């Protein structure tokens, strides 16, 4: 749903890199491998954690029971 | 009074059915056309499927 704090396999903190990954994908015209490398993700265990994240939290957040729609 | 649209989220939350009223107009014909009595009769809330032309989505 929301980005995991750490990589499952090794434990490297990858929770602070999802927004940067999106920025490097959108603003810069970087491919996914280049963006992951420039974030500091060398092991494929760490690369998959960001390369394959879905970010369903944004779709969950549109159903807000506390604000008039 | 004035009725308001109902959407299936309310039916899901109320734990009830999502159904629309069914209306048949009977023909109370007498003597092959001597006189005909017409009267629309509601026949309960007919369930409808979602995303159909009789659903509000």
């Amino acid at each position: 749903m929301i980005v995991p704090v750490r990589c499952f396999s090794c434990g490297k903190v990858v929770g602070d890199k999802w927004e940067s990954y999106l920025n490097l994908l959108q603003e810069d015209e970087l491919d996914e491998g280049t963006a992951l490398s420039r974030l500091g993700l060398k092991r494929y265990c760490c690369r998959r954690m960001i390369l394959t994240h879905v970010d369903l939290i944004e779709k969950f957040l549109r159903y807000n029971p506390l604000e008039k729609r | 009074a004035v009725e308001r649209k109902v959407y299936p989220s309310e039916s899901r939350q109320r734990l009830t059915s999502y159904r629309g009223k069914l209306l048949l107009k009977l023909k109370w014909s007498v003597n092959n056309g001597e006189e005909n009595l017409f009267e629309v009769r509601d026949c309960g809330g007919l369930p409808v499927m979602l995303q159909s032309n009789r659903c509000h989505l």
């Binding site: 807000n64 029971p65 506390l66 604000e67 008039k68 729609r69 | 308001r4 309310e10 939350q13 109320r14």
Partner: protein, 44 residues
Amino acid sequence: LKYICAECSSKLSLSRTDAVRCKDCGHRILLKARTKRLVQFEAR
């Protein structure tokens, strides 16, 4: 104010022996609001 209308999402207080409906609109579904309480957890 311990209840929220399920459609207009306006906070409303429902007294006992009172009609269960939103005061603003005509909605009969109400959601209990979560109030401030201590709830322990394990960060595991």
